[PDB]
Amino acid sequence: GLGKAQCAALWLQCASGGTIGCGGGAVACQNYRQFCR
Numbered sequence: 001g002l003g004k005a006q007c008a009a010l011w012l013q014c015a016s017g018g019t020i021g022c023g024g025g026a027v028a029c030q031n032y033r034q035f036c037r
């Protein structure tokens, strides 16, 4: 997304498991390193 707050929320959400991806947000955490270095 790289969108504003979209990116931060994406990593932050992965903290609880409430990302926009909805579904196994576990992997959403690493996705951040790949998308947002």
Ligand SMILES: *[C@@H]1O[C@H](CO)[C@@H](O)[C@H](O)[C@H]1O
Pocket (backbone or CB within 6 Å): 021, 022, 023, 024
């Ligand atoms: C997250 O949202 C998707 C689609 O909206 C759904 O398939 C998942 O079950 C849900 O966790």
